[PDB]
């Protein structure tokens, strides 16, 4: 017998403290605000990019992958296998939506620590990645040059737009068929007689209320209201969902509790295409709510982002 527990894992804590360590060497803030005291330093802009990672047990230990269809996420597995390192993972620090991760071969898989506990998040892993296109346009600087006889060649540079305003695109049709699929797995978990509803985030720090993430060394915040508004019966056919975003300088650190401020955006264009691999959900029941369950976007704890991709692994001693 070999019991697994993704929620009381220790690779999840190990990787967490490592990924944080990466940032604090490859991404310096112009001023950080922690423990009351404040430090300001020069901050040369750099193109940070999510670079693949293999978790590797030390000399004398082995990792164990469980390859069972529709895995509980916890509890004894049968078709286990030994490894040395984990298949490359992309350390995506993001909320509301998990990006560039592994998917299910079969159907959608909702996993949780406690389903009945409405304070516990619901890791929803997709079986078919939805594509999202985020980008800050090069709309802003209006340069031009006068060409003519006897004309000298200078260039007139003046900015006319908000250099911080971006947007993302999603396939309306894909996303709709995606939600309707999660609601199916939820109904087959809380009851068929139950009704399903998605509703936006309740409130809190910017990073949580709005699907945040990093791209091209810049911090995005995307008003994901269009995303999570669906009542089963409610750009109707085949169009293109687009949501508003904004680059911010003043972000609240995820590493520890506090704020940090970075340099303004860099000239040019900023574009990232990523796979929506899964979503962090959260539930809310109040002593029986008539007969209908609502679901909001979650996220904010990065141990969750890790756990979604380490749920099959367990490190063990080879004595």
């Amino acid at each position: 017998t070999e019991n697994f527990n993704m929620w009381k894992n220790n690779m999840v804590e190990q990787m967490h403290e490592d990924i944080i360590s990466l940032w604090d060497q490859s991404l310096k803030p112009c001023v950080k605000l922690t423990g009351g005291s404040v430090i300001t330093q020069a901050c040369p802009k750099v193109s940070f990019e999510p670079i693949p990672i293999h978790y590797c047990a030390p000399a004398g230990f082995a990792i164990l992958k469980c390859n069972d269809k529709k895995f509980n996420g916890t509890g004894p597995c049968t078709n286990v296998s030994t490894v040395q390192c984990t298949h490359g993972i992309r350390p995506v620090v993001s909320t509301q939506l998990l990006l560039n991760g592994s998917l299910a071969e079969e159907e959608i898989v909702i996993r949780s620590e406690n389903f009945t506990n409405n304070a516990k998040t619901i890791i929803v892993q997709l079986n078919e990645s939805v594509v999202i296109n985020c980008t800050r346009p090069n709309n802003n600087t209006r340069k031009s040059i006068n060409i003519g006889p006897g004309r000298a060649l200078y260039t007139t540079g003046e900015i006319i737009g908000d250099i911080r305003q971006a947007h993302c695109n999603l396939s309306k049709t894909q996303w709709e068929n995606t939600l309707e699929q999660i609601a199916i797995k939820l109904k087959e978990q809380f009851g068929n007689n139950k009704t399903i509803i998605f509703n936006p985030s309740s409130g809190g720090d910017p990073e949580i209320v709005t699907h945040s993430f990093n791209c091209g060394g810049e911090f995005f915040y995307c008003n994901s209201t269009q995303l999570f508004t669906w009542n089963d019966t409610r750009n109707n056919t085949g169009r293109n969902i687009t949501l508003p975003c904004r680059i911010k300088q003043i972000i609240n650190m995820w590493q520890e509790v506090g704020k940090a401020m970075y340099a303004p955006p860099i000239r040019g264009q900023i574009r990232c295409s990523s796979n929506i691999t899964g979503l962090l959900l959260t539930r809310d029941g109040g002593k029986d709510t008539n007969g209908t369950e609502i679901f909001r976007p979650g996220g904010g704890d990065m141990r969750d982002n890790w756990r979604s991709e380490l749920y099959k692994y367990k490190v063990v001693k080879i004595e």
Epitope: V31, Q41, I250, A263, I266
Partner: antibody
Framework: EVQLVQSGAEVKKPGSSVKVSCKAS????????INWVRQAPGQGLEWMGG????????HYAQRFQGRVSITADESTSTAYMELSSLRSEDTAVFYC???????????????????????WGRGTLVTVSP | DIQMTQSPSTLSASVGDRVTITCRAS??????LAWYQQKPGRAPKLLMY???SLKSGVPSRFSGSGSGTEFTLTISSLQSDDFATYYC?????????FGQGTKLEIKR
């Protein structure tokens, strides 16, 4: 133009307090990061404290922790730096320096954030005599 | 905290003569330095920022060089309007430290 205006010459007997001013003639106030710098007679430059452009946060050197308080008056677009408990050694000149006010809607420099002082107050001498 | 040190303290320099000033740090601070000129009884004014980058409205005879720990302020030709004191600031991290000071005088 875009200069910084400082208040006049102050004369204080030990044990009192004085609050110096510093107006921003041009540009936009929220773009300025006004840091105060001290220079004692026949002595070199010494940094004192400053505000954080988009924070309102004011941080000071350890030497001047519980003695100085730098405030910012948005209405009149003026920055103030009061100094409590005056002694004889604080006789000095207090400039208000500040990196050029680049518009908030502007692509980032290569320095990331400019902590060098582009603009300087004319000079405010403060003598502490009985 | 970072300790700044200039050289030399006093400088008996002639006219037109090419001269270089140094400034060494307590740690590696990249290329984040700045040189200030200050005439007697007057507010200091910035010439060189970014360790070597000149600023708009600054003469061409002034040349900043170096990086890491050792830095240099070089002057090609010398006029009668360059006999002031010079300070090195380090706009790397707070607290921002300045230089000791070097008085550029005349020789006879």
């Amino acid at each position: 133009e875009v200069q910084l205006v400082q208040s006049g010459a102050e004369v204080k007997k030990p044990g009192s307090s004085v609050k110096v001013s510093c107006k921003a003639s041009g540009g936009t106030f929220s773009n300025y990061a006004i840091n105060w710098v001290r220079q004692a007679p026949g002595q070199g430059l010494e940094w004192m404290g400053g505000i954080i452009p988009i924070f309102n946060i004011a941080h000071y050197a350890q030497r001047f922790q519980g003695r100085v308080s730098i405030t910012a008056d948005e209405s009149t677009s003026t920055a103030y730096m009061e100094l409590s408990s005056l002694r004889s050694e604080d006789t000095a000149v207090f400039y208000c320096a500040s990196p050029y006010p680049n518009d908030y809607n502007d692509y980032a420099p290569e320095e990331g954030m400019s902590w060098y002082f582009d603009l300087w107050g004319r000079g405010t001498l403060v003598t502490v005599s009985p | 905290d970072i300790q700044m040190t200039q050289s030399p303290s006093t400088l008996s320099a002639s006219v037109g003569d090419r001269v270089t000033i140094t400034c060494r740090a307590s740690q590696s601070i990249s290329n984040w330095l700045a040189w200030y000129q200050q005439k007697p009884g007057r507010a200091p004014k910035l010439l060189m920022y970014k360790a070597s980058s000149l600023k708009s409205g600054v003469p061409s005879r002034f040349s900043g060089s170096g990086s890491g720990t050792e830095f240099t302020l070089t002057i090609s030709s010398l006029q009668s309007d360059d006999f002031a004191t010079y300070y090195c600031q380090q706009h790397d991290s707070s607290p921002y430290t300045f230089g000791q000071g070097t008085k550029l005088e005349i020789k006879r």
